[PDB]
Amino acid sequence: LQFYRNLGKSGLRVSCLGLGTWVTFGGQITDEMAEHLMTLAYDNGINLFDTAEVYAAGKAEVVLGNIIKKKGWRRSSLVITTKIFWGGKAETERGLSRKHIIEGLKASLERLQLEYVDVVFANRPDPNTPMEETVRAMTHVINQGMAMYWGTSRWSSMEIMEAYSVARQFNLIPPICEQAEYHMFQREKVEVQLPELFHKIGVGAMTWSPLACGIVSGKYDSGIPPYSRASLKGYQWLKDKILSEEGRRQQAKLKELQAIAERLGCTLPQLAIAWCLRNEGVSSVLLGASNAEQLMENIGAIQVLPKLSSSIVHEIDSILGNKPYS
Amino acid sequence: LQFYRNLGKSGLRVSCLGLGTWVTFGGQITDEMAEHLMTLAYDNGINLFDTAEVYAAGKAEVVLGNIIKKKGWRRSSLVITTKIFWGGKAETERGLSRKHIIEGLKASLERLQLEYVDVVFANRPDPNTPMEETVRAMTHVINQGMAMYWGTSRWSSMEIMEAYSVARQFNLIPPICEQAEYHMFQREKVEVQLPELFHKIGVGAMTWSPLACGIVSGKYDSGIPPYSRASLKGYQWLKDKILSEEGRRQQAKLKELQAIAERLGCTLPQLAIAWCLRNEGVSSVLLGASNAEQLMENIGAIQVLPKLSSSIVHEIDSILGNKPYS
Amino acid sequence: LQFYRNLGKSGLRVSCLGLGTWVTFGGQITDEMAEHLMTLAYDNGINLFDTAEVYAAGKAEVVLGNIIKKKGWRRSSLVITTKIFWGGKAETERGLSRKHIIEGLKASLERLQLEYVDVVFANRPDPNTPMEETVRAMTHVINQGMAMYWGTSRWSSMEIMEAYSVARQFNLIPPICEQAEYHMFQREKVEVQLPELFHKIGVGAMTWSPLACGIVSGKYDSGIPPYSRASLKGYQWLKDKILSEEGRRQQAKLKELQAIAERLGCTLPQLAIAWCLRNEGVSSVLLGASNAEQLMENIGAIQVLPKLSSSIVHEIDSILGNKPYS
Amino acid sequence: LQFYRNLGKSGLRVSCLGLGTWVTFGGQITDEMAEHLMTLAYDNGINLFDTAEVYAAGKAEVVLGNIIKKKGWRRSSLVITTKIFWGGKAETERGLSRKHIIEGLKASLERLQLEYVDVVFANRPDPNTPMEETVRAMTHVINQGMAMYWGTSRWSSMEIMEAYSVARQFNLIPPICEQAEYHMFQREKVEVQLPELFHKIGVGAMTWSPLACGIVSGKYDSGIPPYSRASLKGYQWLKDKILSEEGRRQQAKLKELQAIAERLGCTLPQLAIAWCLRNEGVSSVLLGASNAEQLMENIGAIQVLPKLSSSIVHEIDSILGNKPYS
Amino acid sequence: CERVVINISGLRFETQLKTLAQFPETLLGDPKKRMRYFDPLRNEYFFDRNRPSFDAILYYYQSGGRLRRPVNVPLDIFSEEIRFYELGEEAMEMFREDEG
Amino acid sequence: CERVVINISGLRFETQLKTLAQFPETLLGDPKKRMRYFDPLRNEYFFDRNRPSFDAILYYYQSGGRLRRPVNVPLDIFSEEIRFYELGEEAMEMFREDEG
């Protein structure tokens, strides 16, 4: 219903859909396609773009930056986010140390050709860095105006709570968002744990891989299509997942879901994506797309949102049989 | 009596009269007239100039900046204020989010061709932004030296108190001023609520629209004069107010007040404006003016201030019949 | 005994003697003389130079800056201090408001052609500015690296304590020094009140006008010598003091002191100056000088310091008859 | 076993071995040799380089900086540290005063041609500077991004605890490391006192002079070899130590240790160095080297680390007879 | 609901503003009356008074009217406080009778 | 182990989260029940209630179940608190009997 919504309880407004750059920008697709994908997303209202120093070893950040600088869009109208953790082969180029967070974000900002990002995320937890150091660094880069806000990714509730806790302890800035995986086959965290952090400390959820890397699109029904992500070099892990006993069990479930899809008159993707936004707990879902078609199809999920009756949901819960117990 | 007075309990000294730029700068009047208006105000002692990113979609800020840069006045002798809230058509270009306050003030500062403003105001309250975020952003722009102080506008007492409260909670800087509407037909807030915040937390009042947009000048007695604000394109709302049942009731009251005006030997405007400053609760009143004549007339209100005996006041209270109950 | 000593309990080391620029730099004496005076003082170990935005309407600051830039001395070897309060004819160009402290110090720093000063002082108290605002501004300019430390001047103990108190309250930086008047005819504050603040909160005293503007030199015995400060245009106030009933009473006392002076084999000036440093409560005494001779004579006070036996002191106390009761 | 390890409990990862620049860079050895030494160390995994404003009166810092700028290594892959305390002949150019720490580090950073250092150390304690001033300055230079972290050197436990304590008191940044002397003939502090600070407040130890300035290499057995440090001009103090009653007692003990050395098939140096890392209490040991041979030999200590059985240790304890009582 | 902080000689008490509004005539319930003891620097009302007594003075409002004298507080002292805080003659007597 | 802060009318109490998890049905031990009193600004749970009583209410959890009424706290008052904090009818009676 509401296309834009507050990211968590922060004042930052984001579209319920955002466009990510993992695997595609500076990698799988071309710069012309990247440009096209972003322009489409932009003109269609999406103001959220997510990237990360690790994507295509910095290249994704370069491409995204170029597109922004080329289309000359107003910075105040974009919400750019980037993740930090893996920024190099050297010992000190990974982690959430004050040294890496500063150098890391600086490097990214340079690549993006931007003075700052709207939200910087810890790409994953760092057992080798004291929480205080990490929150102090995040709070530092924000005061230096290199970021507007910060957030976590792949952190447990306790970990997020620890961060929040430390911030209050030392009067630093708490995280405003957790970037978590969410799709019909990965629901536990977003559906059970995060809503509590949302109500308690206002942390919102920005979910990723709505189509479980393309899997929920059903295109892996008869196997590994040529030019699909599972086919790409360096993604054997994905291929392997798809062709596993568990992988197959899912695909099988897709067939059934597909039914509900045609019934409501929309593609399976649109169903899954809209399925992700069904609950106000999710502030925004990051989309992935290698084609302009894939993107436009996905954006359609919004129209599907009104049709998601409580019955339709219960039905999907049934076919999935994985509804987590609160 | 005292031409300059502390804005609230802060150390910032302001003239009891200031010149605003709403509707006129970069809009209704010309740059030559704007220049003339400011020079007059300046040479007559006024050091307070108020503007806002929203006025004439940034243009007011450009004109005001140009005049300052042209007259080469010493920055240390001017007290420039600007308001932030509506800075663009994009979702993220409105509100009191950290993103908008920073970008917003930055944009304004650029337009004004100034390194900072003396006071930055939240143009109105923002239900979509946590108070902590807002106070943290205000406190940030001040430490970055983009502003000397910050203040609120159109905020309820509770809201101002919340801001103050949060600042003490996190050791940030409290607001020093509330820019509220005040004229003979809008007295409740300034006369009842703000004096409490002034005594309790030192927040001062900088009131606007002393002539209720020209209405208290009486010029709308026989109707909508050509070239008057109510006549301007885009001000149907004002015209409508003027020509309403309530609008007329006021005008009628003006006639009577006019009597007291001639009696004390000054124009009705001077009476209303001086009426606004009668109580030390008000630190400064922002004037509006499209003519050099209108301005010089208005500045005369100061001479009228001594004549405002307790009787004269009680008399006006009578004809108005709207004295708020404390 | 110890030529350098900690300014208060701070880590800042200063010579017990410093050279000020009131009345002389950019005013009474010439730039060539100013240069000569500073070079002498420097080569003789003095690292403390005091000035103020108000001295010669900024000119003193220009001259001092030029000398520093010309002699190419290492900045890390100089301790420059400047006072802020009276920086202009405009309403907002005076006081201890955040606006003035920032603009004021910035202006001074520009004039001095320096990136920062070692210590910035509030030239006098400001009843129109909340202490919190003032301490916050001082603390701001130090974090911006425009000053190393800050201090007060002509503030009462209670006032200094209030400042210290507010700093601890909001975790800001307390003042480290009070620049107070001190000479044989002005002893109360430095001898009674400041030692308490020194022991309690570590605030040290940097005293001024050791020769009560030249008076303790005795040169006003027979009257107002030509080319003396009391003779200078704009110093009628001094002349008047010198030629007053009280003025004469002092001069008379000088004659007697002069005796003790010849007895210890040093000039009366050296006696008075050394008299000022007799107690470790005083960190440094700021000297004033219009001649290279006056300066070299004054510097001699140091040799006199060992001769100041408890008897010599008691004797002087007698002739003065103004020893304050603790 | 683990080549890289957290410096204390901070997130900063350092090699267990680092290369220092005392006596050699810009002094004893040549720039070509310095370059060679650093390149070797680098290519062999060492990311830690230690210097100090006092080394070769700034020259060491220049040489180290040049090498970094020449080899064009990525800054994010180096961990540079520098010590501050003795930076000049002037009174104010020494100590831990806010003035000196700022100016001092700035000077160093300039020499190194770097925007910041990873860790800045107080080279020794400063009885003339309040701890609060010092911690505030350290915390300042880190927020200014001139350093990532700070640490102490030659400070007593109580002193380090005081620093930590003050930081928590004023919500500043605590020290993360203490650079202490450690070798078979100097064990008390590192072996008894620091482990407590490590467990209690996470402060790690970065030890120096593993070969007691070359002494533990045994090369001083028959006397002072030509071109050895004890022979260098300005090191009579070292020569004297070596040729003292105590100096000899050590050398004598070396002979015995040498036995254990040949027994495990490694040089005495490698034994001593590896001996320093035997306990996880030590985060990194700073090496000293005038030859490329000396360096490569020393780096070999790592291979020796596995052979250090509890027996081998007890044996060494015996021959040394200086195991400190906890 | 907006909360208030009351500092009684260093001992800090906290309650919601409506809790105190439940008795508009008392000193703490009357904005105009408590205004004199507000500290803008700390955002709290300060009273240089008896610490032991205030426990009950505050419970009075939270309890809706219960005014019991802490077992460890003398009768003459606690009475003075009830008077100062301006609890009201009614509640005042009710206390008296519930006390003797 | 992650600790919790409970503010009872300005009086601050601190305990570990497992200590409160030892009685999952009580108000403080039940995440869903105490959630309503959490203050995000200060990271603590606030209760506008009786200060003297909470001492025991907390000791109850730390002691593993001991519920004694502070000598200086009336019987009718302390009983109300035990009820509010939802300690449970069992412990509730056990207290009753240990008290009369």
Ligand SMILES: NC(=O)c1ccc[n+]([C@@H]2O[C@H](COP(=O)([O-])OP(=O)(O)OC[C@H]3O[C@@H](n4cnc5c(N)ncnc54)[C@H](OP(=O)(O)O)[C@@H]3O)[C@@H](O)[C@H]2O)c1
């Ligand atoms: N915070 C973290 O740790 C984290 C981790 C992972 C991702 N993320 C973020 O989340 C975003 C989510 O991206 P994702 O790749 O995971 O998303 P996804 O929705 O699971 O997968 C998108 C991929 O599936 C395929 N696809 C997309 N739409 C399709 C459609 N309508 N029909 C058929 N196939 C379609 C595309 O092409 P092919 O498969 O044909 O190439 C595309 O590459 C990323 O871009 C990144 O910004 C964050």
Ligand SMILES: NC(=O)c1ccc[n+]([C@@H]2O[C@H](COP(=O)([O-])OP(=O)(O)OC[C@H]3O[C@@H](n4cnc5c(N)ncnc54)[C@H](OP(=O)(O)O)[C@@H]3O)[C@@H](O)[C@H]2O)c1
């Ligand atoms: N914080 C906020 O939300 C807020 C909101 C509104 C305004 N403000 C500020 O407050 C200032 C107050 O301005 P205002 O326009 O509201 O003021 P005002 O005093 O109510 O109205 C001024 C307008 O009335 C007419 N007028 C002025 N003097 C006159 C005279 N002596 N005789 C006859 N007509 C006269 C002028 O020309 P015409 O009518 O002939 O064109 C002028 O445009 C603004 O400039 C702005 O800076 C702030």
Ligand SMILES: NC(=O)c1ccc[n+]([C@@H]2O[C@H](COP(=O)([O-])OP(=O)(O)OC[C@H]3O[C@@H](n4cnc5c(N)ncnc54)[C@H](OP(=O)(O)O)[C@@H]3O)[C@@H](O)[C@H]2O)c1
């Ligand atoms: N913080 C404040 O509010 C404040 C206020 C005042 C001053 N200060 C500082 O304190 C410093 C003290 O300066 P001051 O002028 O007050 O000092 P002073 O020692 O009282 O007087 C110095 C003046 O007396 C004369 N004189 C100096 N040495 C002499 C000697 N040996 N024999 C005879 N006459 C001699 C000089 O020439 P003539 O008299 O012949 O011209 C000189 O101008 C200033 O420069 C300023 O930096 C601070």
Ligand SMILES: NC(=O)c1ccc[n+]([C@@H]2O[C@H](COP(=O)([O-])OP(=O)(O)OC[C@H]3O[C@@H](n4cnc5c(N)ncnc54)[C@H](OP(=O)(O)O)[C@@H]3O)[C@@H](O)[C@H]2O)c1
């Ligand atoms: N924080 C502080 O106060 C502090 C104080 C001192 C040092 N440090 C740091 O700690 C580092 C440690 O350096 P250091 O000089 O004390 O170390 P060291 O290991 O005690 O001595 C190194 C010196 O011994 C000789 N040497 C090295 N390896 C040898 C080998 N394998 N065989 C024979 N002789 C060998 C070298 O040449 P020659 O003897 O032949 O010239 C070299 O100059 C310094 O560079 C500095 O960065 C810090």
